[PDB]
Amino acid sequence: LYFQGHMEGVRWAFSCGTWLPSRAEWLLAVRSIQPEEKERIGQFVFARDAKAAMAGRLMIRKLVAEKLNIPWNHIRLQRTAKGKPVLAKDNPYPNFNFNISHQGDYAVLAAEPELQVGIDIMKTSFPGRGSIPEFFHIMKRKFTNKEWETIRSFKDEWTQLDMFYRNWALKESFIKAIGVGLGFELQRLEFDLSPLNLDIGQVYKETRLFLDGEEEKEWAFEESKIDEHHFVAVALRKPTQRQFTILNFNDLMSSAVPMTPEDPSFWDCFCFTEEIPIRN
Ligand SMILES: CC(C)(COP(=O)(O)OP(=O)(O)OC[C@H]1O[C@@H](n2cnc3c(N)ncnc32)[C@H](O)[C@@H]1OP(=O)(O)O)[C@@H](O)C(=O)NCCC(=O)NCCS
Ligand SMILES: [Cl-]
Ligand SMILES: [Mg+2]
């Protein structure tokens, strides 16, 4: 009917872990977000967390600005009672919605014009305390009997770890899609992971979810490895390229404009993990 573009699904990542902005670039970014979000970021103790959260905000603003054609300074983002970022009530889309996650060295965003969307990123890391088996026993309540049988079916304990983190990202993607936050009973959610082995450079779409013991055929999941050690899961509730495009700071700043005045307190106020021994 109209001479107009139609939004497709968006899959974007940003390497916040290797982002090293100058001071002017950091402070410009701080100016380009909402005041209450800026306040929230100014209270993180560590730089890597401030950087991750900043990246998430800028990705969400670039999304709305460029896919909904709303001036950056006119984007009004809100949060549900359970913390979930949402776009304030009226674009022309049936169910425009978006979700981010930030873990290890990356921020990731998924968005969709109609499908309800959730995302999680997890990095495989050896346990901070105790053996792998002790970790699995501490974490027992998060996964069902059948999910544990799959996780523990590999001979290699590290492969079991990968599989643990993959199943975690999958469940958290579902939970984030529906916005319930904390307290969802994880025993209710049973994923049947397929295929068993994932390589870099493909999106995989065969995993299925059973909720309260019945297959939820209206939900689909996309799984990929952004690198050898980071797993991403997108959950979607009812010509497609679904690989994540990795953006840089310049791309985050493409439609950005300052919204608050420059704030020098936001420079030189964070700790860095390089200053301490990583333990736990
Ligand atoms: C926020 C939550 C969903 C996950 O926290 P997390 O893993 O530390 O955070 P992630 O980086 O993956 O995602 C955080 C982002 O989600 C968004 N978010 C916040 N609340 C949300 C909610 N209730 N629903 C969906 N997204 C939400 C925010 O944009 C947040 O980024 P920000 O803090 O920079 O604003 C938290 O509610 C939670 O841990 N509950 C689920 C626990 C769970 O069941 N885990 C799976 C175990 S197998
Ligand atoms: Cl913001
Ligand atoms: Mg998470």
Author numbering: 18 to 107, 110 to 257, 274 to 315
The authors write:
The posttranslational modification of a conserved serine residue in carrier proteins with a phosphopantetheinyl moiety transferred from coenzyme A through the enzyme phosphopantetheinyl transferase (PPT) is vital to all living organisms. Molecular cloning and biochemical characterization of human PPT revealed that this cytosolic enzyme is a Mg2+-requiring monomeric enzyme that exhibits a broad acceptor substrate specificity. Whereas microbial genomes contain more than one PPT, only one PPT has been identified in mammals. This enzyme exhibits a broad substrate specificity and is able to phosphopantetheinylate the ACP components of the cytosolic and the mitochondrial FAS systems, as well as aminoadipate semialdehyde dehydrogenase, the human ortholog to the yeast lys5 gene. Human phosphopantetheinyl transferase exhibits an α/β fold and 2-fold pseudosymmetry similar to the Sfp phosphopantetheinyl transferase from Bacillus subtilis.
CoA is bound in a bent conformation with the pyrophosphate group at the apex of the bend, and clear density is observed for all parts of the molecule including the phosphopantheteinyl moiety. The 3-phospho-adenosine portion of CoA is tightly bound through a combination of hydrophobic and hydrogen-bonding interactions contributed by residues Lys89, Lys91, Asn108, Arg47, and Arg86. The latter two basic residues play a key role by forming salt bridges to the oxygen atoms of the 3′-phosphate of the adenine ribose. In addition, the Nɛ2 nitrogen of the imidazole side chain of His111 binds to the 3′-phosphate group. The α-phosphate group of the pyrophosphate moiety is held in place by interactions with the main-chain amide of His111 and the side-chain hydroxyl of Ser110, while the phosphopantheteinyl group is bound through interactions with side and main chains of residues Glu181, Gly190, Leu191, and Leu195. Magnesium is coordinated by the α and β groups of the CoA pyrophosphate, the carboxylates of Asp129 and Glu181, and one water molecule. A sixth ligand for the Mg is not present in the final crystallographic model; however, there is some residual density that implies this position may be occupied by a poorly ordered water molecule. The metal cation is found in a solvent inaccessible area, shielded by protein and CoA moieties. As found in many other Mg binding proteins, PPT has, besides the inner coordination sphere of the ligands described above, a hydrophobic outer shell that is provided by residues Ile130, Met131, Tyr174, and Trp177, thus creating an environment of high hydrophobic contrast. In the PPT-CoA complex, the long C-terminal coil of the enzyme (residues 290–305) is highly ordered due to its participation in crystal packing with two other subunits in the crystal lattice.
